[PDB]
């Protein structure tokens, strides 16, 4: 087994080094000569490729940066001059300055924190790892890694009865109700009586058919007291550990 893999390794090294691409022992001295014809600067490119991050060394006290890698421009669309010559407190979300003070406070101790940085007002979430190196400075790489409510539909969560236990803001545009008006009440209360039974049937089925998505339509009573036709597609959500029925997840869509 050893001989075959050794020969395959020599062949790989020959197929890899193209300047004798066929003797044997000379391949090794050739490989050393082709290796001496060449690993430091490319680690930054590897970090930028995998993690989409940039290095920066920042003064621990004043927050003024003392160095910033060029990769700040790929990451945050920000010129190197915009970062060099300023403090991190200016390059971060205002509500994020306090945390920064706790992270920049003071020692080769590590540092790991998340913060919203300004990019080229638009803020982006940046995960910063690094360590404290006296120069006191913090040398750290920071990397980059739905919000629909803040409108044809809105999603809601219900208990088994139908009581709104959660509603996203889109309701205020679809049915016209404030979330407080729907929460705490059963969905059948907002149904035209001629449809109520049908609705209830679905709520008995989505529980009886656990994990399957059913869809029923009914005339929702809107804030303007209109009978707005609506297609609710709902399913039962289950706790991945104990399979515990957690709530019925409905998606009420104006139709």
């Amino acid at each position: 087994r050893r001989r075959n893999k050794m020969t395959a390794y020599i062949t790989e090294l020959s197929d890899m080094v193209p300047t004798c691409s066929p003797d044997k022992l000379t391949i090794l001295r050739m490989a050393v000569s082709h290796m001496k014809s060449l690993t430091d600067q490319e680690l930054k490119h590897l970090i930028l490729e995998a993690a989409d991050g940039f290095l920066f060394i920042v003064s621990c006290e004043t927050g003024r940066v003392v160095y910033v890698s060029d990769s700040v421009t790929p990451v945050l669309n920000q010129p190197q001059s915009e970062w060099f010559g300023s403090t991190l407190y200016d390059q971060v979300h205002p509500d994020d300055v306090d945390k920064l003070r706790e992270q920049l406070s003071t020692m080769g101790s590590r540092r790991s924190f998340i913060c919203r940085m300004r990019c080229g007002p638009h803020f982006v979430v940046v995960h910063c790892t690094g360590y404290i190196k006296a120069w006191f400075c913090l040398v750290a790489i920071g990397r980059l890694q739905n919000c629909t409510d803040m409108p044809t539909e809105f999603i809601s969560r219900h208990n088994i009865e139908g009581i709104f236990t959660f509603v996203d803001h889109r309701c205020v545009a679809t049915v016209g109700y404030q979330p407080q008006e729907l929460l705490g009440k059963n969905i059948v209360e907002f149904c035209h009586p001629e449809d109520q039974q049908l609705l209830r049937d679905s709520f008995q089925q989505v529980v009886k058919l656990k994990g399957q998505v059913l869809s029923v339509m009914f005339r929702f009573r809107s804030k303007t007291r209109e009978w707005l036709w609506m297609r609710t597609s709902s399913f039962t959500f289950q706790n991945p550990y104990s399979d515990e029925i957690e709530y019925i997840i409905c998606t009420n869509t104006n139709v």
Partner: peptide
């Protein structure tokens, strides 16, 4: 600048 990028990392590449 290898020690800077390598030690300021909570992981390996």
């Amino acid at each position: 600048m290898d020690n800077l990028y390598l030690k300021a990392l909570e992981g390996f590449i």
